[PDB]
């Protein structure tokens, strides 16, 4: 029944009292008397100790030490001594610990996971490297396209030489070169109609990032609603990084839920058919990173993925993030009544 | 004087009228008729045409047309045909969407020298983005060897690289992706305020390193005594962070805005600190840091972190910036 202060907690005299912990969990306590007692209690836990073995070394009243202990424990500033077991994924461990999770356990869930990356352009490139190096067991690369030179902007795993080769091929080569303890596989396919979706295997989650055709997302959705298959969308609209929704069968809203005359209508169609995204690495990467963060959480099960029932957008030309509601609707034409 | 519609514009029927543009420029138009008129004039520029011409082309009232033209030109949905000319091709629509001549922006970048003071997580990511975007010369600064525990964030390193010098590998991997760029390495680690002098002069310094702790305070004060621009980037566990971007005589910096018993425990506990790394957070901070460098050097748009330290949460939907503009009462400026 040992507890130990996590190495990720930093304290700091601030304002009247002080700060405890860093990041999203940072707590500000105004009462100097209390803040100081928390510091004294935490100090007693630097070495794996039990509640009592720690109180004995404390020079404060058992009542206070107790309130300080409760503080530290709920915010996960102190965690079970067992959660501290040189590994290649050692870095990620502190992260999981900070969320009250068991590193080992989490890592275990990732290893037994199978993830599918649909469309290996800019998004699937970054998502796959994050997932691969984080410990995802199997990755299925689904893309029947070829590397060009103009692709060397957001596709971080490619070198010019690779030009002419298959994306799915180069990614695997590059993924294994970074983590040989996982398995990668390719599927020469390109979702053209709705029928092609049957060609994609079953898996913990599907990362859908390719943007073609216009209503590709809509078929992946439709299909996945009936296939009870979890999936997450990612991409961008020019300068806006976008990720989500993260669809989960029976516990979340689907893409369609919360959803031009004669000559003008043809003009609309011609201008759009003429559309080509204004790609930009920074935007592509923000979208990929946050998408991957959500896939690791959804699978690791230690914190709530952000894009559950939401389509999130992060701007690049202004400090702004905004999410569109996509919660379950009983009145849905895809998975409703 | 020819004008051409951008490929990055999109349109759709929505609510009462429609949407024109995608991304931050996306504007909703109420008047269904004004919408329809906007697409009608935009239609005359799928293929390049001058003002006068399009006018004698589209059958819309010279009044309504003029309005639609200016609208499209001001939002940059329509640009000078000359701006529509390559390796950095996919980046041209981005600069075009901000009303800049991609070739000129692509040129400012080619003539820039960027220094990456820290080749770990942020360094790796910032470094590959600048290189593949065209930053002409990049100075990689550091004195550490690749480890196994690093393959988690340093997207450039492989298992077969473990042990080698970071700058050595980052440099190889960069030239491998953009063979027309000039990279270089300097085996150095800032251990004291006197180490900074050993760091070259450049358009901007990407301060990624986070050791010692008070390295950013050191750099702030030094960069002011060298009139050197720098942008800090990193993370506070699960919160990505980038900025401020310091620009001599234009913005502010990291300086503007005794009970011995406890202070002991405090120091002892803080010395055991270890950051709670997470690649997603790392990547976001680096992506945005790089977007700011590319903008600062390309002048086509305002960097987001000018006078500001931005934070992007990861366990919560939230972005927040701590303003810190110029200030007189400072220990550096």
């Amino acid at each position: 029944m040992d507890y130990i202060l996590g190495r990720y907690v930093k304290i700091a005299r601030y304002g009247s009292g002080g700060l405890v912990g860093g990041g999203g969990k940072e707590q500000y306590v105004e009462n100097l008397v209390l803040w100081e007692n928390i510091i004294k209690t935490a100090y007693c836990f630097i070495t794996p100790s039990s509640y009592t073995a720690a109180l004995e070394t404390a020079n404060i009243p058992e009542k206070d030490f107790s309130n300080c202990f409760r503080f530290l424990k709920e915010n996960f500033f102190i965690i079970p001594g067992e959660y501290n077991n040189n590994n290649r994924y050692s870095r990620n461990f502190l992260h999981y610990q900070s969320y009250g999770a068991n590193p080992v356990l989490v890592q275990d869930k990732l290893k037994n996971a199978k993830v599918v990356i649909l469309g290996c352009g800019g998004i699937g490139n970054h998502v796959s490297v994050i997932l691969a190096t984080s410990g995802i067991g199997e990755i299925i690369l689904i893309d029947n396209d070829q590397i060009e030179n103009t692709n060397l902007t957001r596709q971080v795993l490619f070198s010019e030489d690779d030009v002419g080769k298959n994306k799915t091929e180069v990614i695997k080569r590059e993924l294994l070169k970074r983590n040989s303890e996982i398995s990668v596989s390719e599927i020469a396919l390109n979702i053209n109609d709705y029928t092609d979706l049957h060609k994609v295997p079953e898996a913990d989650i599907w990362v859908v990032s390719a943007d073609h055709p216009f209503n590709l997302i809509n078929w992946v959705n439709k299909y996945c609603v009936r296939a009870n298959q979890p999936y997450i969308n990612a991409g961008y609209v020019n300068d806006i990084a976008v990720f989500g929704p993260l669809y989960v069968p029976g516990k979340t809203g689907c893409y369609e839920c919360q959803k031009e005359k004669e000559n003008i209508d043809h003009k609309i169609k011609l201008i759009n058919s003429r559309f080509k995204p204004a790609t930009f690495a920074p935007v592509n990467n923000v979208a990929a990173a946050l998408c991957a963060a959500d896939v690791i959480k959804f699978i690791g099960k230690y914190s709530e993925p952000l894009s559950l029932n939401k389509r999130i957008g992060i701007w690049s030309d202004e400090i702004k993030i905004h999410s569109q509601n996509m919660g379950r609707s009983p009145v849905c034409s895809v998975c409703g009544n | 004087m020819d004008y051409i519609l951008g490929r990055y514009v999109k349109i759709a029927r929505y609510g009462s009228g429609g949407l024109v543009g995608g991304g931050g420029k996306e504007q909703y138009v109420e008047n269904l008729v004004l919408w329809e008129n906007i697409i009608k004039t935009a239609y005359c520029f799928i293929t390049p045409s001058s003002y006068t011409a399009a006018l004698e082309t589209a059958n819309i009232p010279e009044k309504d047309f003029s309005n639609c033209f200016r609208f499209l030109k001001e939002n940059f949905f329509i640009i000078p045909g000359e701006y529509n000319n390559n390796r950095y091709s996919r980046n041209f629509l981005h600069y075009q969407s901000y009303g800049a001549n991609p070739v000129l922006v692509q040129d400012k970048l080619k003539n820039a020298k960027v220094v990456i003071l820290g080749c770990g997580g942020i360094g790796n990511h910032v470094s590959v983005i600048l290189a593949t975007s065209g930053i002409g010369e990049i100075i990689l600064i550091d004195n550490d060897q690749i480890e196994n525990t690093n393959l988690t964030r340093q997207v450039l390193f492989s298992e077969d690289d473990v042990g080698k010098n970071k700058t050595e590998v980052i440099k190889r991997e960069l030239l491998k992706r953009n063979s027309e760029i000039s990279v270089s390495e300097i085996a150095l680690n800032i251990n004291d305020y006197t180490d900074l002098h050993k760091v070259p002069e450049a358009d901007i310094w990407v301060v990624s390193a986070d050791h010692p702790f008070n390295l950013i305070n050191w750099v702030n004060k030094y960069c002011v005594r060298a009139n050197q621009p720098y942008i800090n980037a990193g993370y506070v566990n699960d919160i990505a962070v980038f900025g401020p971007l310091y620009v001599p005589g234009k913005t502010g910096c990291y300086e503007c805005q005794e009970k011995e018993n406890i202070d002991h425990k405090i120091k002892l506990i803080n010395s055991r600190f270890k950051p709670a790394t997470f690649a997603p957070v790392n990547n976001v901070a680096a992506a945005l840091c790089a977007a700011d460098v590319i903008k600062f050097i390309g002048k086509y748009s305002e960097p987001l972190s000018l006078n500001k330290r931005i934070g992007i949460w990861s366990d919560e939907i939230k972005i927040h910036s701590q303003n810190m503009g110029r200030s007189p009462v400072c220990s550096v400026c």
Binding site: D211, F214, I217, Y236, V242 | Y14, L19, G23, E26
Partner: peptide
């Protein structure tokens, strides 16, 4: 933010 990803 009102179109494809």
């Amino acid at each position: 933010m009102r179109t494809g990803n």
